[PDB]
Amino acid sequence: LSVGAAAGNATPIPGYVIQSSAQVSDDSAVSKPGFPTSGWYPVSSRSTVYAGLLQNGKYADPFYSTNMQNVPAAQFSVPWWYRTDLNVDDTSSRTYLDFSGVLSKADVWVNGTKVATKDQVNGAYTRHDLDITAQVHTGVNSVAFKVYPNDPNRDLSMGWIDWAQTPPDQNMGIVRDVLVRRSGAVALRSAHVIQKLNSALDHADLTVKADVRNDSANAVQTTVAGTVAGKPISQTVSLAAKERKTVTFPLVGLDRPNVWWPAGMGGQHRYDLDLTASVGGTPSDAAKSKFGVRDVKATLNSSGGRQYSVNGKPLLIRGGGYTPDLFLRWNETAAADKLKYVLNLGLNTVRLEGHIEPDEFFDIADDLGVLTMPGWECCDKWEGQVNGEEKGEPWVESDYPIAKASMFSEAERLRDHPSVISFHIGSDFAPDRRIEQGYLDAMKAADFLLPVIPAASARPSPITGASGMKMNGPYDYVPPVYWYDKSQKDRGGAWSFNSATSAGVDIPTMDTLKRMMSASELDTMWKNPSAKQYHRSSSDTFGNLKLFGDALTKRYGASANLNDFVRKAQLSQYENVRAEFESHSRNYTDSTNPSTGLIYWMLNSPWTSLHWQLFDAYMDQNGAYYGAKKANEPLHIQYSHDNRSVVVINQTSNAVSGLTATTKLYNLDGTEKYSNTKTGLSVGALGAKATAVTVPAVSGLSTTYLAKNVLTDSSGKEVSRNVYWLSTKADTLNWGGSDWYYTPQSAFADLSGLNNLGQSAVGATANSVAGADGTTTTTVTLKNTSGGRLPAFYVDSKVVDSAGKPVLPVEWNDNAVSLWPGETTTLTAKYRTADLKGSKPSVRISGWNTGTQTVPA
Ligand SMILES: N[C@@H]1[C@@H](O)[C@H](O[C@@H]2O[C@H](CO)[C@@H](O)[C@H](O)[C@H]2N)[C@@H](CO)O[C@H]1O
């Protein structure tokens, strides 16, 4: 690792060699050039200690079975050393280390000199700008961090609450870049752009602000100059030695701006800011950044619910809680792939309960137009001052400055990313008056002007007041019809802002299960859902799958084997997830106590998991994935579980007309028991609704029966198809036996008729085209080819290689389809050609009642 004396440079350290402090008797030696590093582990940038060890193949894959449990934890109760060499070609310019992402705290050493202590460098989110000119010399230099162990209850850091299992190193390390910075007498820092757009959206007057710091021994004059959005800006100011000033540039108008819009509402353009700070007529430093022209409000409506709007357009928030990799392994591509999945799912937002991702994540979200909901996390140090019996230690005087500094640093990162619609200063508990003032003050200081939400629960903060959100559960199984209830003010019904709720277990696809659990573990899974699974939660509330398994047995029938359990798990996850979203969609436009947002719990998992996920750790797509995708289609037909209303949802930003909504009922022997065609439907923009018909109570329906919704646009084209499997027996709730994380059932619906649905057939043809942009698009055509009256039900197509393994990540236009005899559908799958790994592409088609076939592609 080198540096160029050219003033402006901000090169990240590309790697380190790491080792336990157990191996080091003389702290000061580690940073002296030529210190012997034999037996040290080389790790890439942004590594936890444990991620660093795995990179070196020192332990088995923790995604598989109980591998993570065989890792001795004790070795991570002492500090570890992160160490690298640093070539300096010319110490003409000053040298800085600028960084964050240290868990939990660190000593910083340069060339035998301790330049900062763990007291000065403390907290994952705190930024640090260390002037190390005094210690740097020409040639080979050395920098070493003594990173201290991490405890999320004690440290203003990251913890994993109850999502998965505790990583053995408890995430200790450096999980962001350490930047080596070079500049002259004057350092440029904190350059940003306050932007205020008018309500006609055709003018913005922009305010550029940036700090300059004179780290030389004498007074200087410095000119700060460059462009913002195609406009010259320039300011000259004076500076004493060691002095820092905030330069505020004069206002700049931008007549007709390229407004930034969420996915599906317009472009995702960003403008540039580009400043050079100069001394004696020479660049001393320089900073390039981006920003979006976009307004965002989150106001409380008349029923007391939080309501987002972007560029004056109100939106129902539809998304899921986002989590990074359990050992915080970063990969830019993987981050874009995940955000791209949000758009495949048709969601508009992700929430980050702490674990706030590096800058690139937000760059991508900005470009994709995916909205982000960052904030602090519950259930550990962050709320330890205000959460009573909940895990997390009470604050001491020294916690407050770190807390505030953390807020300032994150606000400083987030402020100019248009995808950000708010920061959450609380999650389960809102902070007290002291801590909230610190948080609000840090925001003002950074010019963070985005909505501030006191909590994701219902608890209000002293100063910002009501949240307009709720966290009543559930997080484990409830019947689909639960989601439709507005009568229980203490429950997770579709009203207000559901900031974190799901129905628990989300069994991943077979291809995934086999990679994550041994045959014996999988055997136990279906036979005894009541037993602990290492790949659910470390929490006792969610250590097992009892609640899911009783429900799955009683509703769909007892399980014969693994395949039976799994295919039943997928229909239940498809059924539940769909209902959860479709209910919130419908109740959006309700006059009184409407639904304002829904954050599914969760969008993804930190590792290979059995719950709280839409996509799994390998990017694979199951029942719950398909269920949300269906529920969130842009032009969509649904059916209400509470009252049989056939509703139509238009998520797009244009009103739409000439819509025909064909709705049919069938028994399990294929006999049509009802039919409706509503023609000339007109549904307005951005999640407006129209009823097509309320299905009447029909007699002679089989115990288990189907519903077939079809929606076509005025040019023909089938735009939405939605198939329900229902029961003349109803799911009912024993509301009185409710606990915080679910509501128990008194009655169960009977969908076991599905066990006996007669065989059908499909009916498949596929071919592929590889683009010059290194993607492949595979086109499959499905047909119900049988001569009966039975549908080809829950047909699932997967791009696979010759090994029959799924090509991932992948994005379908539609999947898990149901076709009545003679009907046809054409599907599109897009994926990177390289993920095929030289193999020829194939498609694996599997139905509930059509068996499995794979056709070439
Ligand atoms: N200890 C619970 C707390 O976990 C819960 O809030 C959410 O719970 C999810 C499931 O436990 C969890 O994954 C998420 O991180 C939490 N924000 C609250 C409120 O429902 O109650 C506490 O008793």
Q: Is 448 in the pocket of ligand 1 (CB under 6 A)?
A: no
Assess contact for 752 and 556: CB atoms under 8 A: yes
Tokens standing for residue 304: 């007391």
Same domain, 578 and 641: no
Same domain, 478 and 622: yes
Residue type, 522: L
| 144 bridge partner residues | 83, 109
Query: Which whole-number Å values give the CA distances from 368 to 16, 265, 267, 337, 361, in the listed order?
Result: 33, 11, 9, 11, 10
Same domain, 370 and 507: yes
| For the CA of 353, the nearest atom of ligand 1 | 15
CATH, residue 647: 2.60.40.10
Q: Is 161 in the pocket of ligand 1 (CB under 6 A)?
A: yes
Assess contact for 164 and 40: CB atoms under 8 A: no
CA 417 – CA 374 distance, rounded (Å): 12
On the question of a cis peptide bond just before residue 763, with omega within 30 degrees of 0, the verdict is yes
Q: Is 471 in the pocket of ligand 1 (CB under 6 A)?
A: yes
- B/e letters for 60-95, b = 16+ CB within 10 Å, e = fewer, are eebbbbeebeebeeebbeebbbbbbbbebeebebbb
Pocket residue to mutate for ligand 1, from 353, 373, 427, 428, most atoms within 8 A of Cβ: 428
Tell me the longest C-alpha to C-alpha distance in the chain.
93
Assess contact for 476 and 741: CB atoms under 8 A: yes
Same domain, 236 and 304: no
| 246 bridge partner residues | 211
Tokens standing for residue 263: 């996915």
CA 354 – CA 24 distance, rounded (Å): 33
- B/e letters for 826-851, b = 16+ CB within 10 Å, e = fewer, are ebebbbbbebbeeeebbbbbbbbbbe
Instruction: Find the radius of gyration of the CA atoms of the chain.
Output: 28
| For the CA of 391, the nearest atom of ligand 1 | 1
Domain stop point among 736, 756, 776:
756
Classify strands 203-214 and 186-197 as parallel, antiparallel or unpaired: antiparallel
Same domain, 92 and 67: yes
Residue 376 zone, left/alpha/beta (φ > 0; ψ -120 to 50; rest): beta
Domain stop point among 247, 266, 294:
294
Q: Of all protein residues, whose CA lies closest to atom 6 belonging to ligand 1? A: 428
Residue 360 DSSP class? H
Assess contact for 98 and 10: CB atoms under 8 A: yes
CA 90 – CA 92 distance, rounded (Å): 5
Query: Which whole-number Å values give the CA distances from 570 to 239, 556, 582, 732, in the listed order?
Result: 65, 11, 18, 22
Same domain, 535 and 684: no
CATH, residue 419: 3.20.20.80
Same domain, 173 and 220: no
Classify strands 792-800 and 775-783 as parallel, antiparallel or unpaired: unpaired
Same domain, 734 and 697: yes
User: Domain range spanning residue 711?
Assistant: 634-756
Angle at 457 between CA 453 and CA 459, to 5 degrees: 80
Q: Is 352 in the pocket of ligand 1 (CB under 6 A)?
A: no
Please name which of 597, 752, 734 lies closest in space to residue 668, comparing C-alpha atoms.
752
Q: Is 353 in the pocket of ligand 1 (CB under 6 A)?
A: yes
Phi–psi pair at 56, nearest 5 degrees: -100, 10
Q: Of all protein residues, whose CA lies closest to atom 5 belonging to ligand 1? A: 428
Q: Is 739 in the pocket of ligand 1 (CB under 6 A)?
A: no
Collapsed DSSP state (helix, strand, coil) of residue 101:
coil
CA 159 – CA 586 distance, rounded (Å): 35
| For the CA of 740, the nearest atom of ligand 1 | 20
Tokens standing for residue 592: 């009184």
113-116: strand order across its sheet: 41-44, 15-20, 80-88, 139-147, 106-110, 113-116
Same domain, 198 and 64: no
Assess contact for 651 and 634: CB atoms under 8 A: yes
CA 121 – CA 157 distance, rounded (Å): 12
Assess contact for 136 and 88: CB atoms under 8 A: yes
Same domain, 168 and 209: no
Residue type, 327: F
Domain stop point among 154, 184, 214:
184
| 306 bridge partner residues | 300
Assess contact for 631 and 578: CB atoms under 8 A: yes
- B/e letters for 192-205, b = 16+ CB within 10 Å, e = fewer, are bbbbebeeebeebe
Count structural domains, the chain.
Answer: 5
Phi–psi pair at 26, nearest 5 degrees: -125, 85
Q: Is 431 in the pocket of ligand 1 (CB under 6 A)?
A: no
Distance of CA 47 to the CA centre of its chain: 20
CA 467 – CA 459 distance, rounded (Å): 7
Distance from Cα 428 to the centre of ligand 1, integer Å? 7
Residue type, 729: K
Residue keyed to tokens 């200790």: 172
CA 425 – CA 440 distance, rounded (Å): 9
Distance from Cα 469 to the centre of ligand 1, integer Å? 14
Assess contact for 709 and 646: CB atoms under 8 A: yes
Distance of CA 707 to the CA centre of its chain: 33
| For the CA of 163, the nearest atom of ligand 1 | 13
Q: Is 379 in the pocket of ligand 1 (CB under 6 A)?
A: yes
Same domain, 763 and 728: no
CA 488 – CA 495 distance, rounded (Å): 10
Which distant-in-sequence residues (6+ apart) come within 8 Å of 196 by Cβ? 204, 205, 206, 207
Distance from Cα 746 to the centre of ligand 1, integer Å? 25
Q: Of all protein residues, whose CA lies closest to atom 12 belonging to ligand 1? A: 162
Query: Which whole-number Å values give the CA distances from 419 to 290, 359, 367, 416, 422, in the listed order?
Result: 12, 12, 9, 9, 9
Same domain, 58 and 200: no
